[PDB]
């Protein structure tokens, strides 16, 4: 959900992309400039829905 | 049957990476 | 997903032929002295 | 007539500010008359 | 034999300041109308009666804003002689009628033509081999392809990029907004010998100025220099292991380093001269039929690529009645396509 | 011991020469009015 | 040894084995064309040339056999709807045999030429040393191809002894294979002129007759023959490509722009017939014709040719495609079945309203109808809540005259906005989708294909030219430069004219 | 018949005929007279 | 044979002619835009784009 | 009887590692427009 | 070398390797007839072009 | 060097500034006078700002005939009053 | 057109005004290349 | 007909694959000196 309004956009080839429509996506709006580290999340699930990979990387 | 197309060219890169720095023509002075 | 299904064997030529060639080429330039 | 009377730094000053005042000329157009927006 | 093509020969191939020779013939003065008709069109004509759009100097228009612009659809792709049949032989309404364009490209092209034969002819001269020419023809390839073969292909000169600053800004925006450019696979490759030439440039320049060899006293290191010198005036086997350990891999065979600069970029240009050919006929990489079946079916299927296309049809819907005014386009407010409050 | 009129010098002015006039031409532009 | 991209050079000073290598290719050229017919005719639907014609199908050879008169099948069909005919041999499939006949030949030829490399013929009689005399060489070549452009103008196109080519009308409506007089005067250099395509290969053949006895006859100057190299075979391969490339601009313009000799029934229309509404100009003054001379709106639009509305239709404009929708253009919008008829809208107040046609720079275009004098009426709104021009609010229905829907009229909305978004369009036709799984995207005609790939080769071609030529013209430098060259050929000053050490 | 555009194109040809032969009359001529040293 | 076994890894003397190069790319436009130091010649080559993609960035 | 004109031909291992990074490379690249 | 049949018979069309006439020869002419040949193609150009317009020539489909 | 006289020499001797001293305002001043007459517009037919448009009307000028373009951008030209 | 005439002046006077001050070794120099 | 359509690849790799690997052996064995 990059832009915060619970729109989820699929960026991974097992999701429906190729190499060149696929991303990482960034970090859900929601978030803006706050630190999002995996143990900031309730679980894994919520860190993926929100864009957690996005920080880290 | 796409997916593994682009995963499996990707790793074959990561190989050719590996012997590429590792087992290349080694450069010798003269 | 409904991919072009020659897509496959279009990509798997495309790497196989050329790569092949090469192949071919330094094999028998090491096999020389 | 015989080159070397004007030393050069002289003539690369004069130059340089003629430069100046020709571009500077430009940018005042900018804000006047044709193509200022007003 | 003697002759006076024999003499004419020895004059042209003086040793002069500026060089000449027979290709000069060809080269200065198309090159030079060339850039006069630029100089001239952008300073005092205007693209009133093929564009409505002002552009030049005496309008108003500054360095960004002026340019020499293409003729008018209903032109096709006449040739626009000054003695042709549409201006008849009348300078100021040939301006208007868009006549410095084609005047421009026309004589462009031919003096590239003249510069290429210019690199062969001094290049035989002087004892060289040819690569500067070589490398000279994707210039060539890039300048014929967009400027002539696309409008060619097209339904007149009016869609050919303009000869300016913003025109041609405009120019890549509607191919992202007609063509989706930036998903060709052609123009992929072309950014990549662009980025990758540049990239090239930096790293070479960099790895010399910092393996040089002490070769003087100074702090500065430039004299330190002779052009006669037959040494190396930098290590190439220091610049091998600090990059070996640094990346990986090096080069080491300096001659192969300087034709990959070569290649590079120039096939790079090539590469991006072949979709623009491509996109002369609308034959363009614009979807993904695979993409647009899913999300055809699934409003819940959403990614960059479809993103993107929503742009597309913004630029293509809010641009084209002011960029296309011959077509006469009345989209009402209430057909525009347009998000959210914006 | 030179020449005065070269190749050079005709290279020189073909560019030279319009430069000048375009430059008032556009000096003049500055004070147009709409 | 040598390096891979150099292999080919093995043969520059062996005439028997590039003869050889020569053939190779020539057998491979034929067994290309010979197995693309085959192909072709093992997919071909001929049963509907009207809604269903060869560049719909992506046919790309047929259409060539076509052009110079093969028309018909061995199974008893032919291109022109006709059943029962007897082509004799040179059918498709004659043909298509004849090219895989001579494939196998040039192929036993290029081994017998490579085993016996070494032949008398190939030696200079007073060296010994390999050696073709490429000027003469020329002058023979030419004077053959003079003989055959002749003979094929003047008994082919002709129909002396041949059947000519095909001819249409302005419309592309009753094509046929046609024996074509000459046209000697100045509408003989018109490109839609067939008459003109006779009188140039007769024209152009003599000359070349002529050219060609006296290339063999009067030797090169020793100028121009030390300028250009004319010993070293490479020059003539850099000047053969130059050529080539000319010669392929050329077919990729007038396949664009269309001529007599890319006729719109065997590779499609052209982009232009649709940005100047060249059909529908057409049909209207068909149509006039016949309400002026009494008949009803019904009448008139059902006089319209199934096979002329089909032209007036986007989905056959070649700029309508993409560069990777591959196939067959009926696997995009589908197999043509009919012409639904021509669409008439009306609003609440009976005004006749139209739909403005999309250009073919768009791949989407908003829907959007006027009144004669181009005032908006209706369209189709995008935001719905200031909506003036709704189907709805204006009362928007839609009558069908001709075709399958003649004499019909629908004022539900959803479905007057259907036939309104197909009507951008052009003319309205009914398809078949499911046979071949049609995605619905548009694609490209034999028209488009040709063009772009000849355009492509032409510009790769063009650097070929500079890199033989430049070989040609450097060979002497083409390892490297003078390892003595003395600093003052390249310092300026010491010589008068460059790079001449007499003129110190 | 002499159409007004082949008439257009007879001064085309024309000028260009008198533009090349005007340079390379210069040329010719200003080789003459300035002939290198051999 | 490629052209590139003409140059041996390692070797002292400089594998082309500049002075050479300098004559052509000097004649091609004029003398004085032509570079006869290497030093300054690949110290432009590395601040041209250098400087360019700072401003970029 | 032999022909004079034979060539051995060469292609070395940094060759070898240039030519098949550009063919999986543009492989890489293409095959998203073949599956389309 | 081998000697066959067929190559006895064309053996005089392939012995003149090198032979020149002296000087510039039939240049001139060449150059004429170049020059013809460029004001050809510039006529078929500019007709296809609709630069050149004459009398009943009509670029178009409608010459069928 | 290739025998012309160097540049720093030229622009540095009173004979040259003396006679550049006249050439260079004069062609400055021809090119002021090129516009501030109104030659400019005339010559290239670029519109004046009160030529773009008829009072009341706001459509472009624009061409669109081939070969009538010459008569319909005078036509345009008088519609101007 | 007088306007023509006010633009040209300043240019022919400048001509003018070279040629005074060249001409003694214009003339030489053509002398020299004779 | 309703063929598998891996059928194609299954068959084109089956052959090239082994096909190549001879090949390979071959042709480096005729470089082999004498
Ligand atoms: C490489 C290094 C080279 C170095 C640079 C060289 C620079 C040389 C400069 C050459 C300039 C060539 C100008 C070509 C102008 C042109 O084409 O002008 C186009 C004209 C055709 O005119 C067009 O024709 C179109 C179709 O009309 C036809 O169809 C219409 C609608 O149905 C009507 O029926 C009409 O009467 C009928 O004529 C439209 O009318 C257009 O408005 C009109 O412009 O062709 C013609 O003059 C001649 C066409 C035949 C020859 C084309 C070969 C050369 C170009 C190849 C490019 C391929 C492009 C294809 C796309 C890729
Ligand atoms: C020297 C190099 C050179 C070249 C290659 C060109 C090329 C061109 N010019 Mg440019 N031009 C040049 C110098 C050059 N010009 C100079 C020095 C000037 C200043 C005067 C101009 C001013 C100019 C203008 C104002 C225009 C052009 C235009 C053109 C284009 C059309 C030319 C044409 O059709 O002529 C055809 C002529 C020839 C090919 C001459 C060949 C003569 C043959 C070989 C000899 C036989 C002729 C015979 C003796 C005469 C018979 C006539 C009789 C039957 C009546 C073409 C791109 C036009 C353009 O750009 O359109 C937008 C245009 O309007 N040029
Ligand atoms: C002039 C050449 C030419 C043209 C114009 C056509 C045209 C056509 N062919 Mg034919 N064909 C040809 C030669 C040609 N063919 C050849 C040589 C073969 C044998 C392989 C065939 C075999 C063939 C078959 C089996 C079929 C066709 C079909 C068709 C039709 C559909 C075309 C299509 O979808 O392409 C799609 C085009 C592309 C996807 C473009 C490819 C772009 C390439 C891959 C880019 C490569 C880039 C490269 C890797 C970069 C190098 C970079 C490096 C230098 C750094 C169309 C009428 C089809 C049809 O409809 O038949 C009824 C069909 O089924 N053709
Ligand atoms: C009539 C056309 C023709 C002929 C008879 C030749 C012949 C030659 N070329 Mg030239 N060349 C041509 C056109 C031609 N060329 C064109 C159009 C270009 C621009 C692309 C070039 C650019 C070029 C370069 C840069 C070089 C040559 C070189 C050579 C020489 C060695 C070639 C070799 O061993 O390749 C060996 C090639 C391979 C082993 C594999 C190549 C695979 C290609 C890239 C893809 C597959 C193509 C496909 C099978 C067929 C497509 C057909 C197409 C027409 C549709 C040989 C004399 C070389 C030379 O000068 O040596 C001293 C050299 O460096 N050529
Ligand atoms: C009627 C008529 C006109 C008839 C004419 C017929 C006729 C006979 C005419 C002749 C008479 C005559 C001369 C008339 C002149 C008319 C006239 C003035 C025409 C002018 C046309 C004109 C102004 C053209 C402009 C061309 C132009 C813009 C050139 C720009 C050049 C430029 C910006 C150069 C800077 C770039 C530069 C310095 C790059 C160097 C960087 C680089 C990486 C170099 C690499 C490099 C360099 C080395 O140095 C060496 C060593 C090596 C190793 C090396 O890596
Ligand atoms: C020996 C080597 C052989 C294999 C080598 C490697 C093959 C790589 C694949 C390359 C082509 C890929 C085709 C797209 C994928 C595909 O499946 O297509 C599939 C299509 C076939 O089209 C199919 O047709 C069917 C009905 O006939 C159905 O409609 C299918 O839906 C449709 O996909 O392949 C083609 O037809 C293309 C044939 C060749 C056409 C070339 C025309 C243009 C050539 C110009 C290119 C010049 C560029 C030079 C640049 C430098
Ligand atoms: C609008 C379309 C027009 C169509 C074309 C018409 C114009 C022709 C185009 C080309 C014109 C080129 C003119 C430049 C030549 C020049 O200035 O030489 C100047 C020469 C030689 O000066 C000399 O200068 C020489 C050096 S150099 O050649 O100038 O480099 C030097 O060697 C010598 O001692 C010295 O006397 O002096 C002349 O008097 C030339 C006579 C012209 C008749
Ligand atoms: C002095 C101001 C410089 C500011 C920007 C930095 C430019 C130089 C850095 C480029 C980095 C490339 C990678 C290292 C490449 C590398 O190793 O360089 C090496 C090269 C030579 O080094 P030396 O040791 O010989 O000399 C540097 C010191 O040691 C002092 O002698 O360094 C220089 O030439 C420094 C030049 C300073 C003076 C340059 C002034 C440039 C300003 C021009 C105006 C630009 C404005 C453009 C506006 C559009
Ligand atoms: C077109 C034509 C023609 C021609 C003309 C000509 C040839 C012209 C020329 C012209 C010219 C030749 C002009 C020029 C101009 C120039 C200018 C206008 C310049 C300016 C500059 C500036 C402004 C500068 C700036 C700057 C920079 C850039 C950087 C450094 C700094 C500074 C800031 C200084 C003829 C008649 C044949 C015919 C008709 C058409
Ligand atoms: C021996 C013999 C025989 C037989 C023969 C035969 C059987 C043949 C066949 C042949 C053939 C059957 C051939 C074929 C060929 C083919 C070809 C030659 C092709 C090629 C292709 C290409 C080259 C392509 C390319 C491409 C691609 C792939 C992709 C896209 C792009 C392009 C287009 C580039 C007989 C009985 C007669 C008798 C005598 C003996
Ligand atoms: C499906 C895709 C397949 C693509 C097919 C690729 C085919 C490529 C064939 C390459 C053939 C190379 O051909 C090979 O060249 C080598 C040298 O290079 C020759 O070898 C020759 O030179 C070497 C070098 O000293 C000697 O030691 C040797 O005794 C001699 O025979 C071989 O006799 C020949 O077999
Ligand atoms: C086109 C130019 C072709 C050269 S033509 C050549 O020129 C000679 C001058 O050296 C004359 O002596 C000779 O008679 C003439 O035929
Ligand atoms: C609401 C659906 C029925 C209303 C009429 C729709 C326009 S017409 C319709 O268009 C289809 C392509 O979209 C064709 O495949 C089909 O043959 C045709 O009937
Ligand atoms: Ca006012
Ligand atoms: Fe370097
Ligand atoms: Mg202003």
């Known amino acids: 959900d990059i832009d915060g309004i619970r729109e989820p956009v699929s960026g991974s080839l097992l999701y429906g992309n190729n190499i060149i429509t696929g991303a990482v996506v960034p970090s859900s709006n929601a978030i803006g400039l706050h630190f999002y580290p995996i143990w900031e999340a309730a679980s894994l699930d919520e860190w993926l829905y929100n864009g957690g990979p996005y920080q880290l990387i | 049957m796409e997916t593994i197309t682009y995963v499996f060219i990707f790793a074959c890169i990561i190989a050719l990476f590996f012997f590429a720095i590792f087992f290349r023509e080694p450069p010798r002075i003269t | 997903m409904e991919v072009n299904q020659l897509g496959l064997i279009a990509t798997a030529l495309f790497v196989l032929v050329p790569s092949v060639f090469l192949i071919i080429l330094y094999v028998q330039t090491e096999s020389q002295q | 007539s015989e080159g070397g009377r004007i030393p050069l730094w002289i003539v690369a000053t004069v130059a340089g500010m003629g430069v100046i005042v020709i571009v500077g000329l430009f940018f005042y157009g900018a804000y006047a008359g044709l193509g200022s927006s007003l | 034999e003697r002759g006076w093509f024999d003499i004419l020969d020895d004059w042209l191939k003086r040793d002069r300041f500026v060089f000449v020779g027979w290709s000069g013939i060809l080269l200065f003065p198309c090159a030079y109308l060339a850039l006069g008709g630029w100089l001239t069109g952008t300073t005092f004509v205007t693209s009133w009666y093929t564009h409505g759009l002002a552009s030049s100097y005496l309008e108003g228009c500054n360095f960004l804003t002026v340019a020499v612009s293409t003729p008018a659809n209903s032109m096709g792709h006449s040739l626009l002689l000054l003695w042709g049949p549409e201006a008849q032989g009348d300078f100021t309404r040939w301006c208007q009628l868009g006549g410095l364009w084609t005047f421009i490209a026309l004589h462009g092209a031919f003096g590239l033509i003249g510069f290429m034969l210019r690199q062969f002819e001094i290049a035989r001269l002087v004892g ?215 | 011991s030179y020449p005065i009129f070269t190749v050079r010098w005709v290279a020189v002015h073909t560019l030279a020469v319009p430069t000048i006039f375009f430059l008032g031409a556009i000096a003049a532009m500055q004070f147009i009015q709409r | 040894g040598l390096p891979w991209y150099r292999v080919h050079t093995v043969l520059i000073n062996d005439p028997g084995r590039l003869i050889a290598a020569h053939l190779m290719h020539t057998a491979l050229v034929a067994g290309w064309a010979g197995s693309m017919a085959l192909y072709e005719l093992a997919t071909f639907d001929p049963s509907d040339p009207v809604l269903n014609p060869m ?66 013929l190939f030696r200079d009689p007073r060296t010994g040393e390999p050696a073709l005399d490429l000027p003469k060489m020329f002058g023979i070549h030419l004077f ?147 309400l002026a001379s009494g008949a009803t709106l019904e009448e008139a639009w059902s006089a319209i040719p199934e096979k002329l509305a089909f032209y007036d239709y986007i989905g056959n404009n070649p700029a309508k495609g993409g560069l990777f929708r591959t196939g067959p253009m009926n696997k995009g919008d589908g197999i043509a079945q009919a012409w639904k008829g021509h669409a008439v809208f009306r609003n609440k107040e009976g005004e006749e309203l139209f739909v403005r046609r999309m250009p073919a720079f768009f791949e989407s275009f908003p829907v959007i109808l006027t009144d004669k004098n181009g005032v908006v009426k209706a369209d189709i709104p995008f935001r719905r809540a200031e909506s003036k021009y709704s189907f709805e609010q204006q009362g928007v229905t839609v009558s069908f005259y001709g075709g ?101 | 018949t002499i159409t007004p555009s082949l008439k257009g194109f007879f001064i085309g040809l024309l000028s260009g005929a008198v533009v090349l032969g005007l340079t390379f009359a210069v040329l010719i001529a200003i080789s003459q007279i300035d002939k290198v040293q051999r | ?38 030093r300054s010649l690949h110290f432009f080559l590395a601040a041209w784009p250098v400087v360019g993609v700072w401003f970029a960035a | 009887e032999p022909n004079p004109n034979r060539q051995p031909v060469e292609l070395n291992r940094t060759s070898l590692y240039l030519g098949l990074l550009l063919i999986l490379v543009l492989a890489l690249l293409f095959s998203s427009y073949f599956f389309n | 070398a081998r000697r066959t049949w067929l190559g006895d018979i064309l053996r005089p069309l392939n012995s003149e390797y090198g032979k020149v006439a ?36 009509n670029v178009s489909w409608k010459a069928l | 060097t290739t025998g012309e006289r160097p540049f720093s020499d030229i622009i540095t001797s009173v004979r040259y500034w003396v006679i550049h001293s006249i050439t260079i305002p004069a062609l400055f001043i021809a090119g002021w006078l090129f516009v501030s007459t109104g030659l400019a517009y005339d010559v290239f037919g670029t519109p004046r700002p009160d030529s773009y448009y008829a009072q009341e009307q706001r459509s472009i000028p624009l061409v669109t005939d081939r070969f009538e373009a010459k008569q319909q951008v005078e036509t345009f030209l008088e519609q101007l009053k | 057109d007088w306007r023509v005439l006010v633009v040209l002046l300043p240019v022919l006077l400048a001509a003018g005004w070279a040629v005074r001050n060249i001409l003694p070794y214009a003339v030489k120099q053509v002398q020299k290349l004779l």
């Open chain 5, 128 to 342: 060289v081999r040819p690569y500067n020419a070589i490398a000279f023809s994707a210039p060539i390839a890039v300048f014929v392809s967009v400027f002539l073969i696309y409008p060619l292909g097209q339904s007149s000169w009016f869609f050919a990029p303009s000869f300016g600053v913003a025109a041609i800004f405009r120019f890549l925006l509607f191919f992202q907004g007609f063509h989706n450019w930036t998903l060709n696979p052609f123009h992929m490759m072309g950014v990549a010998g662009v980025l990758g030439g540049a990239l090239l440039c930096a790293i070479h320049g960099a790895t010399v100025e910092n393996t040089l060899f002490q070769d003087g006293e100074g702090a500065s290191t430039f004299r330190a220099f002779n052009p006669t010198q037959a040494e190396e005036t930098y290590s190439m086997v220091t610049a091998n292991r600090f990059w070996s350990q640094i990346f990986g891999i090096a080069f080491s065979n300096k001659r192969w380093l300087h034709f990959f600069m070569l290649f590079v970029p120039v096939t790079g240009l090539w590469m991006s001269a072949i979709g623009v050919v491509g996109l002369a006929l609308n034959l363009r990489s614009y979807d993904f039929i695979s993409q647009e079946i899913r999300a055809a079916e699934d409003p819940e299927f959403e990614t960059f690529y479809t993103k993107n296309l929503l742009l597309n049809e913004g630029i293509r819907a809010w641009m084209a009645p002011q960029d296309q005014p011959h077509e006469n386009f009345v989209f009402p407010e209430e057909v525009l396509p347009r998000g959210n409050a914006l």
């Open chain 7, 55 to 120: 560049w719909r199908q992506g046919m790309f050879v047929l259409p060539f056999m076509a052009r110079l008169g093969v028309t018909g099948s061995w199974s008893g069909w032919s291109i022109t709807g006709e059943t029962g005919i007897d082509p004799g041999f040179w059918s498709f499939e004659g043909v298509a045999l004849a090219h895989i006949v001579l494939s196998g030949l040039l192929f036993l030829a290029a081994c017998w030429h490579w085993v016996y490399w070494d032949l008398e």
């Open chain 7, 144 to 290: 053959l191809a003079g003989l055959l452009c002749f003979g094929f103008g003047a008994f082919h196109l002709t129909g002396l002894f041949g059947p000519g080519m095909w001819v249409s009308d302005p419309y592309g409506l009753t094509g046929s294979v046609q024996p074509v007089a000459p046209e000697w005067g100045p509408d003989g250099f018109n490109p839609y002129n067939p008459g003109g395509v006779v009188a140039h290969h007769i024209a152009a053949g003599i000359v070349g007759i002529i050219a060609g006895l006296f290339h063999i006859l009067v030797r090169p100057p020793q100028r121009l023959y030390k300028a250009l190299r004319m010993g070293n075979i490479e020059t003539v391969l850099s000047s053969s490509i130059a050529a080539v490339f000319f010669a392929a601009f050329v077919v990729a313009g007038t396949m664009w722009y269309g001529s007599a000799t890319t006729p719109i029934e065997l590779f499609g229309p052209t982009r232009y017939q649709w940005d100047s509404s060249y059909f529908q100009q057409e049909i209207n003054r068909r149509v006039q014709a016949s």
């Open chain 7, 404 to 504: 399958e829907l003649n004499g019909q009229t629908f004022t539900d909305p959803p479905t007057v906005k259907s036939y309104a978004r197909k009507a951008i369009f052009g003319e309205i036709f009914e398809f078949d989708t499911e046979t071949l799984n049609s995605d619905g995207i548009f694609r490209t005609s034999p028209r488009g294909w040709f063009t772009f790939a000849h355009a492509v080769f032409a510009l790769l071609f063009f650097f070929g030219h500079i890199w033989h030529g430049a070989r040609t013209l450097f060979r002497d430098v083409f390892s490297g430069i003078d390892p003595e060259l003395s600093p003052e050929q390249v310092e300026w000053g010491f010589y008068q004219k460059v790079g001449d050490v007499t003129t110190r």
């Open chain 9, 1 to 38: 044979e490629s052209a590139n076994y003409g140059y041996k890894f390692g070797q002292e003397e400089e594998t082309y002619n500049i002075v050479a190069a300098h004559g052509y790319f000097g004649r091609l436009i004029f003398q004085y835009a032509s570079f006869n130091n290497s």
């Open chain 11, 22 to 57: 002296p000087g510039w020869g039939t240049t001139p002419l060449m150059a004429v007839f170049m020059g013809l040949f460029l004001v050809f193609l510039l006529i078929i150009l500019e007709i296809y072009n609709s630069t050149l317009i004459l009398d009943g020539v």
